[PDB]
Amino acid sequence: KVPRGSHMWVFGYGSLIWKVDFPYQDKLVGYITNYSRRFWQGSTDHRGVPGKPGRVVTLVEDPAGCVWGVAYRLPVGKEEQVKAYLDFGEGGYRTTTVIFYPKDPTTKPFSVLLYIGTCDNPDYLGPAPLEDIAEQIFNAAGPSGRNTEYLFELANSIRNLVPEEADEHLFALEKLVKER
């Protein structure tokens, strides 16, 4: 209710949806537009290893795109510090500000911080046929666990908060992997 002195939100589209390493005062399910979520990023430190990389999500510019996720509000008075913590966790990523549309119609859309991987990033793999991606995911495991666990968790989370049509690429991939 009462206005706050400062505001900063970060949009989570990947693992942040289910697991967060930073403190937050609020969270909301919603979507951003003009980007699409694709498993075109390689993982060598989480869901895969060097020489056997996993596939994880990254955001790609898509004018007709939509990405359903969770926006997290950084703690008031600690936003700048928390951001720094995040900035330091991320190769050549870039941050941008975008409009976040809450699932709840009662809350008005607002600006959020978004972290996006560049082509320049060393782990970027790029597009590949779904069957191949699914295969790579099925066989990959890294310091944080199996790649399949990451895909399934993301799928479960999205499903829990919205219909399956919300993300065709994700659901399709899950199906291909589940076919096993």
Q: Which residues are annotated binding-site positions?
A: 10-15
Domain ranges in the chain are 1-180
Method for structure elucidation? X-ray
Active site residue 165: no
- Residues at the annotated binding site for substrate? 10-15
Resolution for this PDB entry, in angstroms: 2.1
CB atoms within 10 A of CB 129: 8
Catalytic residue among 80, 90, 149, 168: 90
